[PDB]
Structure formats: structure tokens, C-alpha cells
Design a protein around this ligand. Sequence first.
Ligand SMILES: O=C(Cn1cc(-c2ccccc2)nn1)N[C@@H]1O[C@H](CO)[C@@H](O)[C@H](O)[C@H]1O
Ligand SMILES: O=C(Cn1cc(-c2ccccc2)nn1)N[C@@H]1O[C@H](CO)[C@@H](O)[C@H](O)[C@H]1O
Lengths: 807, 807
Amino acid sequence: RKQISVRGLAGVENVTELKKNFNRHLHFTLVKDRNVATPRDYYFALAHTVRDHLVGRWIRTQQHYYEKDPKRIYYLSLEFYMGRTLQNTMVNLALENACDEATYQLGLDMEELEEIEEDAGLGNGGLGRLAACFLDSMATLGLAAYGYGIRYEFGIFNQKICGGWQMEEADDWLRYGNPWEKARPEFTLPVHFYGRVEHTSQGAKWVDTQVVLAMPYDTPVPGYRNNVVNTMRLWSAKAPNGYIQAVLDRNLAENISRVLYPNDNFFEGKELRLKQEYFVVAATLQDIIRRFKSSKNFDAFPDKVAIQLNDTHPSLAIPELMRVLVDLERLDWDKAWEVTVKTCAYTNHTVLPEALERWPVHLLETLLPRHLQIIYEINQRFLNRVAAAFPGDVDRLRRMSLVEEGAVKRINMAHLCIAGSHAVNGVARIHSEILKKTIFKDFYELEPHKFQNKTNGITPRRWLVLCNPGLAEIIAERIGEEYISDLDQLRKLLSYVDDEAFIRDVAKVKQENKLKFAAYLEREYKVHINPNSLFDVQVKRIHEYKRQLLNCLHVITLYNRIKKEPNKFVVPRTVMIGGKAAPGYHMAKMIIKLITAIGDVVNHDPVVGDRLRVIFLENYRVSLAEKVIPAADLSEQISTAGTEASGTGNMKFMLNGALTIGTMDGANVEMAEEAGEENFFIFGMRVEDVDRLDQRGYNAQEYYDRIPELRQIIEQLSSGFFSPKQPDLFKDIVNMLMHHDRFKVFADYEEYVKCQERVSALYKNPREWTRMVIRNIATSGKFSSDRTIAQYAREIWGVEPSRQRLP
Amino acid sequence: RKQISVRGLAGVENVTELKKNFNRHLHFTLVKDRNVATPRDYYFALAHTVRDHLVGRWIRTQQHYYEKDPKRIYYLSLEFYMGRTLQNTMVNLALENACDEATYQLGLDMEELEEIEEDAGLGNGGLGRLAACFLDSMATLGLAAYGYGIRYEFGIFNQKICGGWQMEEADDWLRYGNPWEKARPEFTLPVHFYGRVEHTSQGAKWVDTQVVLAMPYDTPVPGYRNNVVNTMRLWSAKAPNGYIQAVLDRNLAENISRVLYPNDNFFEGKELRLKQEYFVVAATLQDIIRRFKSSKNFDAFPDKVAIQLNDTHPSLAIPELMRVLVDLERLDWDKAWEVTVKTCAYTNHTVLPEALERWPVHLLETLLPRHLQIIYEINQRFLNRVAAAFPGDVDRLRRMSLVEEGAVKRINMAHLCIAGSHAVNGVARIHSEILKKTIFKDFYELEPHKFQNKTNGITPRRWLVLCNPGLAEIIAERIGEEYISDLDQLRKLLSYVDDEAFIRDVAKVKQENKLKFAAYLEREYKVHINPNSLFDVQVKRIHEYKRQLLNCLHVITLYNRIKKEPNKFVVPRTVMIGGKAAPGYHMAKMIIKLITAIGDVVNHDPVVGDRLRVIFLENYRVSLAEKVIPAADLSEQISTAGTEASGTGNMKFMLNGALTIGTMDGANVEMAEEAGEENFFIFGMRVEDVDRLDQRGYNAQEYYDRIPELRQIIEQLSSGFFSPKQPDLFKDIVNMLMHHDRFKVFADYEEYVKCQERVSALYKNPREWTRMVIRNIATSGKFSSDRTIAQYAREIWGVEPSRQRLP
Ligand SMILES: O=C(Cn1cc(-c2ccccc2)nn1)N[C@@H]1O[C@H](CO)[C@@H](O)[C@H](O)[C@H]1O
Ligand SMILES: O=C(Cn1cc(-c2ccccc2)nn1)N[C@@H]1O[C@H](CO)[C@@H](O)[C@H](O)[C@H]1O
């Protein structure tokens, strides 16, 4: 526990100080003594104590940026999936062992206290989590970086499983307060909505607007042991400065920051979402302009400011910057545009067309009339450039236009982003290539230099040192601690593929993690899992494209094969699937019910017993990912080739000693390249094969007709085998698979099942399983978000990263 | 400044500690250094520093009550008009001079910092302020007392005067946080609404309810230098534990604690108000029951619990207690009722019938069906007692019933309170007598021993030591400091009526206070007032019964007399009127406009100049009362005899060296009794004269016809003299005065004007003015809230007060 060297030193005076300040906070902050104090009181006492250690560095870091005046990086995102903060802060400040000892001496278990903290679940999945990893890496690389978002009162809903169905409950994460954030009501700024434009003698004027105030809350972002503490600034909506009804109606403006939209696909043009997006953009850009003016005329703006757009969600930053520069700063259009493009860069996070933001022009006209005017002018000038570059190419003009012309006229926000950014990047090599080749081919041909790749990454602090200290320790024992912020050093572990001690230790750590996770499920849910089974894990948001359904088909295959040949040995498995479904995505909710329904049959068949178990992991979130990923043996990354832009869960599993079964999709391709394909369980159609199927038409019936085992499963689903009380329950799933499957589940069924057999074959050989694991861990280095951020810095932002310590 | 001995000692180590902790909070709490720190940052740094000094005593006091197990006093109120907390805390902890020196050494003006704090304006006027004074006195008298109310997000509206009219703005008092309160989310309790009653085998069951959570926030209440720190617990509404709409709809439940109802007359049966009232009652009584059970079977409940009902607002405590005891604790009705009556006592705060709470039975049935059932049963049994005591007296039964029988059937909450309380008190001798004589005569005849008087009081901490340290000091110089919590010792000052030094000092202090207030108005409003004028002040909520209009008639009289005889010397006056009008009270809003309109003419007449000024004091509130009252020469207390139940502003003025012009109404009668009528400017109808006018009918025309000077004023108002741009502006005021005046303004006009002449006559003689002032200050002792609370304790609660210090 405390013997772990990567967790730092428990200095005698440090431990003494920590205990004293713990007791001080219990007394003065929590207003309790030890007679009435609860575990929650103790968590908060520790949280305040740890937070105090950030303050000096936080003040000094921000003063340093004022003095040194580096180029500032502004990372704009509607989501920051931060998770818990206590352990991360202790890790980054080298205080973990000291706090562990301090709390131990006070008679407390720090790990029990850690479990009290709510996730800051201010994101849906990978995109939100990427922002969080990025904040961490930017601080570790000494960048003058600022995360800007919205402080949702309610993050992603807490998922309850009831009768085998998902139920949503409000994520009241601020119930007991947030000890990390600092409210800054003094720095509140006005955001404007609705109104109209007056074009006068001075120029355009946005008048008769309704005001919503944006109150910032600043959260410290510690770099890894470099004394850097950057800031995440999140804006909270506040009403501006019968009688009773009027006071109650303040809620309407304040609803802007009430809740995170829980849909992570199928764009719905909700006005409240558009208000949220402008809210972040308007308040953030005021901060940016203010800081620019208080630094040392707008010619130098792009030299001192970078705005990174996390998806198209903050794309309004482009017309907002133009609005400020033209209408308020009185710059000519051309200069303002030069500045805007050099300031802004855009990161694209998916190719699925239903995820794209296309706002009706009527909505923009009503809510943001000046922005619509500016967008139209941007479009006219941009299309003039297209017309000059490709004379007579009229369809190209139609395809490239920011304006989409259908029954409802809409603004394509991706097109706006490309036009208004000096850099556009995809999030894995395959994804960035498809952007240039198909999705934004017209844009690539116009401005090829704009288009970049920045393969995603994950922070090895949260995703190794925090969640898997046992693995972090056995690595450090061989190669020292430098890898923690220089993950490419993991390649040194290839020297240990034949090392008996290391092979033993890798396997020991995995078993320890599996025991711990089993203990978690027993403690929290009274669910018993076989610790001597292969932990087969698919955790990620529930999506047709991610193909949890393909996993389901395999699980039933395993079950049916057992029933056909009960005497035949099979490698025992615990198949775990978890993830949230978007509230209004019928198929996703049906998929969750199918997983639980499969479990209802499999988990109670006496012929099967502990040889096969199927469990749905409830409420998958960052804190749960930190528990389950280090316990995983097999990582399910089985999206239809061409659909997962990158993935990041894939990287977490690789770093944590799981082997991967996956398609050649997103960053899976680069992961297999790094490790060697011989060390990955790659199966299924490549993008080229998917396209060939699309060319001739996907007929699911053909696979049904040719595969007896698939036929059996579909008939079980149709006849009510997995829902005897409601035989037609899964008719919609069957219908979709048979007739309306965009993601070709049946087409990868045979290769998936065969590939899974090879997984089982290798697991039967513990030594060779572990050796292949070593080959994976050792080559996961590329997938550090430090590498990713270093690339953003050098290739887009024009800043040089530095691991150099502050005093 | 620091020379003032009543403000305590600036101990060298204390000053050193304070500076250190000030700097510590600036760094760790506010996360600022001195380079960017604002005056607000400095206020909060001081606030946290001072608050830290309360913590030990707060914990020890509450532990002491657990150990000693005294009878607990629960003061239930929908209003706690607390004002600011910083200075009060310093005064009660003897830290004022020490903090003053500490901040001075840091280069700060503590008084400038004090002005940063928002009033906790969680009350409308006298009733809310009485609760606040009561909390202070109960802590000073060492009572195990708990204030229980609602934590309104918005207190009484901030008043703006625009174009001479009142405008309401939301009182966002929590904008920058509240450094005094401690949120206690761990002690959150469920409150139930709506639903229905199931009468089963166990008994009645309240089922199918909607839940609203009540989250307590505890605020320290320091006694005067006795190491006692009691608690004010205020409940905050929290929602219980499409998708987006559902999350937004959490606002509806949370609206219960959103805003204080700003009407202090004309009862409006708003459901939201009824929810607020039950909210406080239900959550509070759960706390009471819990503490009772954790102390040492319900036979001892009234020995360990007192519930004081501040008006009928928390009257639901009566049926709620019965509900808990009968439905949940399974006591028989009779025993539960014995317990309830012995536990509960009711304080009545007015005789004006439109102020009485009469809830429609339909509303109670829908919102609180079990409570309505219980009320009906209470009524049946109570009326059985009436019928047994007064056989055949059928009208008495009708008059006494809790049920009122009109077109809409209603529950009379005052009747419920009397029936369910062992004590009922009025708030001044005249008021308590009229309760027994007329208003509740039937109830007095049934249970004469129930009926009591508890003449109101004010705390001499807030209302002398804090607001008028200069006066507190010259008093202490002669009689020591004991008077501060033993105000009857002010009688010793009668020995100084001929003392040249004291006469000089009293007058000097008043002049200093007048200069300070003049400096306040100049600084904050650029309004210049003549410092060598008599400060004639009427501050209180705007009401017809309080007769700001009578003041207006006199002001115009003064103006008209000047214009008739410009050469004739008159004592220069600054007539100040301030107070808020209820948003939907047309006449009150018209009255404010009349005051400003009179000012518009008077203040700009070159013939008048500085001889007469009329100003409307904007946003009258506790903090402003602390500024203006010590500067006042003349206190206007001119309610129609029989209408003001007590008044408390009257007492504040008396304590602070103003002479009183007033009717024989409320506590004015006792104030004049204490000082001698020769030392008060008493005028107008007595209650008996008002009744005689009522008997024959009030004809305002008769006064108009007989008084040329009144006639002139009414014609000025009617013809548009005070509104030339809108001649008919004051037609409604004229119409009411002439034809619909419930409060007989004209009937007291002549005596008021003549009495005012005598005020001016005395002011011309500085020595005799000051000698009469001494006679007032010296006899204000009875009107300490310590005296009032000592009476509540001994005569109602059955507890003995104690000025004894804690370790
Ligand atoms: O989440 C997204 C894109 N997205 C789409 C939406 C969305 C939100 C509302 C409606 C419709 C779509 N929110 N986020 N992309 C994911 O980004 C990760 C980080 O780059 C990648 O690793 C994943 O492959 C990708 O699916
Ligand atoms: O404020 C009240 C009574 N009251 C009535 C209401 C009310 C609230 C809503 C609608 C109608 C009436 N709120 N409070 N009474 C005042 O109590 C003071 C303290 O006892 C006395 O000094 C005043 O004389 C009395 O007017």
C-alpha cells in the first residue's frame, strides 16, 4: 500500500503538517469534532487540506504567465469529463503517500475517503474525456493553457438498471459542494441573446438584446510534479441584475447552464443547446480579449492567442470573434478575418453524418441575428475564393457552402469551422485521412495545408499511476519513474519479454486488480463474479456503430455451444458490458435490455454455472473506468471499420495490461502498428470491404441463410427465448439486424467468433498471454496525451512544450 | 475611533493573530494576493477571520446543551430580518477594536469594508426584525434557543426610486456567497405535499405525496460576551433524488424557498406561500422530534420543548405536531393534544383584519389533506369545550370556530393558534388588552389564563453599541458597561439631567451622527442636506395606517406657511421619509410618489431654500436604519390610535437620542409612561376617540370645511400643484382622504400641526431639547429585548434566563 515508491515520500514533517491542517479544516471549515464527524466530513477535510497545497503554485503559475507573456492556448469545449480530483491532485503534487500515512495515523482509510467524491461528469464520453486528458497534459507540458466550458449543475445522468432497463436520474454532483473550484463572481460577464441589428454611421450595432450573466468558476489543473497549476474556467448562468413570478422567471436564463445534453449522436437542433454554445463562446472570448489587452494593435492577436475548437460545438467563436473585432474594435473586415483564421483551429471528432451540427437559419436569425449576418458574409467571401480557385465548378460551390439549401435552410457548422480555421485535424490517422479523402475532400483540395492529423491520447497519470499503481510500480522498479511523463520509455519493457520476474509480476498485478474489482461488485451490488475467469470487457457509450450487439451475438454463441456440448472444456469468461444510452435513442435502450436479458438466461443455467457469466456494468463513468480497466483481460473494440474516429478506451486498456480484440478502425490501427499485429486480435472487414458491401448493397439475409449458428440466435431472439414473458420484446432489434443494419453486424459475425476462439486459445497459456501483454504495455507509449498535446503545440499552436519545473 | 472603550481591547497578540489569519484567508480562501485584491476580497478575508472566532464557542455551546439537556426553545418564523453580521459578531466577541487595529495596520479602513456586506434582508419590517432581536437576546440570556425559518434566495426587494416612483429589483444577497452560514446537506429532511389519506388498521396514512427536500443552513448567533453561540437554522428547498425538461422542472420544487413575499398586509391566499409555511413547519418539527429522542415517553415533550409561533405563519406546527404524534408515534388523540398545547405558544402581531390568514379549505384539502382532517377534529373538540362552557350560546360557537362559513369556506389560522397553544400574547400593553377585550374576547372568556402581554423590545447591541458607539461611549464613561446587557441601568442617567458635561456630550454625539449621515447621502446619492436643520424622520413600511400621508399634510403646511409669511423665522427642517411599499398596494405606491412630488416643489423653491427640505430615503432596510436613526432629532410615530400593535422603530429612536412625536398607540403609550408624558410629543385621538368617530361615522368633509389650511392643501393636490404635467395624478389619494379614509388622517391634522409647532419651539432651545433627550434615553431601558425575552422565558417557556459566562 504505502510501500509503493511512485506514490512519493511520507516526510515526517509533511505528515505532521497534513494531520494538523486536516484537523484544522474539520474544526474551522466543516465545524465538526471527531465525535460527530462522518466519512464524508473526513473526505472534505482531506480535500480542503490537499487543495491548500495547490494554491501557492496556482497563484505563481498565473502570475508567471502575466510576467513572461507566452502565447495563451484556449481550449473551448462544451464538455470536460474530469472524473474525481482528490487522488489526481495528490499524485501530481507527490502527496499521495504522505496523505495516506497522515490519514492512517488519524485512524482513517484514505481509499474509503476517496470513494466519497462525486465524479465531475461534465461530459458524455470520449470527447469530454479527451478534453480532460488534454488539460492534464498541457499543464504537464508547461503550456499557458486555459480550459473553457460550462459549469453544468447536472452532468451526465446517473444510470440505474431497473427490471433490466436503463433509468435516468439527475447527477446532482454539487449536492455537498465542490471543494476544488473557486467561484469568481467578481469576474462575471454579460452574454447577449436575441435582439436585432442596427446598421448606422459607425457600422453595425447589436441592440435590444436580452442579457444572461456568465459567472466563472475556476478549477486548478496540476501538471505532473512540475509546480505548474493551470486553470479550467467554467461559466455558470446567472439572471441579470407579478413580482413573485418575475423573480421565479430568473430560472429561465439560469437554465442555460442547468444540464448537459446526454445525446452523443443524432444532432437535435435544440435552442437551449444553441444558447449553451453561444454562452461559452461569448463569455470566453471576452476573457481572451481582456487578457490580450492587459498584456503589453490586433496584428499580434494570433501571436498571443490560440483558440482550439473541440468539435463544432464552440464554432460560434469564429463569427463572435469577427463580431467583436469588426463591430466593437472597429477593424476592417479583411484584417479581422486574417486575425480570426490565424487564431482559430478546429478538431473534428466523427464522420457519422447525424452527429454534424446544422442549425436552421431561422433559429440563428432570431437568437443571434448579427452572427447570422456575419456567417453569410463569411460564406460569400469563402465561396468567392472557391470560385476563383475552381472556375465554373458550380456543384463544388454547392457542396462547400456554409449554407445548406433544403426545405429548412441550415448553416453547416463544420464548413464554418474549416473556413474560419488555419488548421483542421482528425483524431486518428485513418480518420484524418478519410477527412481529406471524402468528407472534406473539396476543402482539402482548396487548402491542403490546413488539414492535419493529431492521433488521440490518454494521460498516463490518471490512466496508469492513479488507477493502476501496482502496474506503475513494477514498471518503475525496472525503468525508473521518468516514463510517467515520457511514456515512450515503456519500450524499454520489451527487454523483459523473457524475464521470469517481470512475467510473474505483470500476471500478479492483473490478478490483484481482478480481485479488487470482484470485491467492488460484491460490496456495492452483491454481484459475484468468478475471479478465475477471463474478464471480457466492452465499456463505452451504447451505440449501434460500436456494436455491443455483435458482442451479444458472440455471448449467445458461447452459451449455445456450451449447451450443445456441455462436456467440452471452454475457458471460463466473465463478459462485462457497460455504458450509457442516450435517453431518446430507442435501439440503444433496447440493446441494454438485451444484455441484461441474455444474462437472465445464461447466469441461471445450471449447465453453464461459472463457465460463462454476462453482466451489465451499471453507471459506467470515469471513476468506474478507473476500476474496471485495470482488471480487464480482453478489451472489446469492435466498431464497424470506418465508424470510430479514434477511440480512447482502447488506449486505456492497452496501457493497463489487457489484450485487444478489434477491427481495423480509428486508433486501433495505430495501436496494432505500434505493438505488431501479431500482438493484437484483429478481425473483420477493413474500410475497403465495408465500402465494397455498400457498393453492391448489404443483404443481412445472406449471412442468416449461410450461418446455422447465427440463424439459431436470431430465432431465439425472435421467438422470445430471451423474453419468455414478452415473446416479441426484441422484434425491433431483429428487424434492424435483418433489414436496416447500417453497421453490418452479421458481416463480421464469423470472423469475430473465430477471432474470439483464438483469444480463448491464448488464455489457456498463461505465460504466452502475459508475454503478449508485455508486448502491448511496452508499445502503448505513443498513446500518451503528452505526445498528442506536444503535436498540437508544435504543429498548430506554434508553442514549444517544456517539462521544466517551476520554483 | 479606536479610543472607544466599549469596543474592547486591541491586544498585541490578538492584533498579530488577526492580521495573520486575515492574510491566510486572502491566500488560501480567496486565492488572491495584495496585487489584485479588491475591497470586497478584504471584506471577505475579515469576515472569514472573524467567523473563525465563533467556531469553538459554537461547537461548545451546542455540546453543552446536549450534556446539560435544558428545555429547548424553538422560535419559528417565516422572517429573520438579520441585517449585516460582521460588526455584530465583533461587538459580541469583544473583537471590534482589535480588528479595527489589525485592518489599520494592514492599511485598510474596517468601516469601508463593513459597507461591502449585504443585509440578510429575510424580513419585511418589524416582525422580521423582532425575530432577529429575539435571537440576539436569547443567546445573551443563555437560553438553549433555536431560530427556525426559510433561507430565501431573495429577501425583501431592493427599492429603486425612478421618476419619483418605487421600482423593485431582486435582492440577490447571496451573489458573492454568505461567509456566516454553514450548509448542512447531510442533515437534509423530506417534506411532503399533496397526496391523500388512507385510513387503515394501524390508523391514518398520508400516501402518494410529492416530496421536497429541506436542506438546513446554520448561522451562528453570538450572545453578548458570554461565550454563548446559538444557531439560526434556515431551510432551503431542494428537488428530491423529456429528460431535459424533467431536470429543468426541478426548479418548481426549489421555488419554495426562492423569494420572500413582500406584502406585509392584505393577506393573499397564495399556494406558494402556504407551501413555504408548511415547508418550515414540517422540516423544523422533524428536527425537534429527533433532538427530543436523542436526549435521554412523549409525556416529557413539553418539559423539553417549547415552540413559539411568530404570528400565524407557522401555525401549521399545531396540526403537524398532532399528525406526527398520532399517525407516526401512535399516541392517542387526547395525549397528543395535551402535549401539543403545552408545547405551543402563539404571538399575535396585529389587529388589522386584512392581515389575518384565512386559508380556503379546498386549498388545504388538496395540498395538505391530513392536516385539514386534523384541523376539523381539533375544531370539533374545541367547540365541544365552548359548548360545555357556554351552553346554548350558538353565535359564540360560530364566532369561535376554526372554520369560517362564507362563499369560500376557510380556516382561521389565528383561531387554530389559540386553540392549540397554552399561551397567547400581544406585543404591547394596549394591543394585548384589545385582544382580550374585542378581537379574541370569546377566547379570553373561555381561557383567560392563556392570554398574556409581552411588550416588544430591541437589542441594545445592534441598536446602540453598533449603530451609535459615540452615544454608547459617553454613557459608559458615566455608568460603566453593565447597561449593555442590563439596559434598565440607563435610569442612572437621570442623575445627569443638569450635568453640563453630559448635556454637552449628548448634543455633540447627535451632531456627529448628523454629519455622518449627511456625508452618507452626499457620498452615495449626491444629495445635500442642511446639517443645521432638525432631522425629522419617519422610517417604516409605507402604510395607510402608519399615516405617512399625515406627515405629507404637515410638510405641505410648513411650505404653505413659509410662502404666506416668507419673513417669519421657522426652525429649519430636513423631513426624511423612507420605507418600502408592497408591490401590489396601489395607495402605498402613490404615497411614495407624493413624497417625491412634494420634494420636487419644496426643494426647488428659492423662497424656501435650506429652511425646508423633503427627501425620500431610498431602500430603507436594517443597515440604513443603523445609519439614520442615530442621526434623527424627531421620531415620527403617528399611526391612528389602535392600529400599530407595538412598533419597534419607536424604541430605536428613543434609545438613540431622538424625541418622539406620536399618538397614544402601541408601545408609544408605554414609552411615554416610562419617560413621563411631559417628555413626549403626544397628540391626536386616543383609541376611545377613534371609536366614538366610528360610532357616528367619519366624515372627512367636515374637517375640510372647517380647516382653511387643510382645504388649501387638498386643492393643491387636486388641481395638480404637485404634478403640473399630470394634474390628476393624485386624484386617488384625494378621493381616499375625502371619502374612503379608514385611518382618519384629517381628524388628527390640527392637533398634529399644533404639536409640531411645539417641537419647533423646543428645538429653538438647544439646552432644553437636550435635557428632554436625556430624560428619554435614560428611561428607554424597559424596551430592551432582553427584558422582553426574560418575560417570554419565565412566563411562557418556563425557563430561567442567565447572563452567566461559558468557559
Ligand atoms: O464524441 C464524439 C463526437 N460528438 C458528437 C456529439 C454529438 C452531440 C450531440 C448531438 C449529436 C452529436 N458529441 N460528440 N466523437 C468521439 O470523439 C472521441 C475523441 O476524439 C473519439 O475517440 C471517438 O472515436 C469519437 O466517437
Ligand atoms: O408585521 C406584522 C404582522 N404581519 C402581517 C403580515 C402579513 C403578511 C402577508 C400578508 C398579510 C399580512 N406580516 N406580518 N406586525 C407588526 O409586528 C411588529 C412586531 O411585533 C409590531 O411592532 C408592529 O406594530 C406590527 O405592525
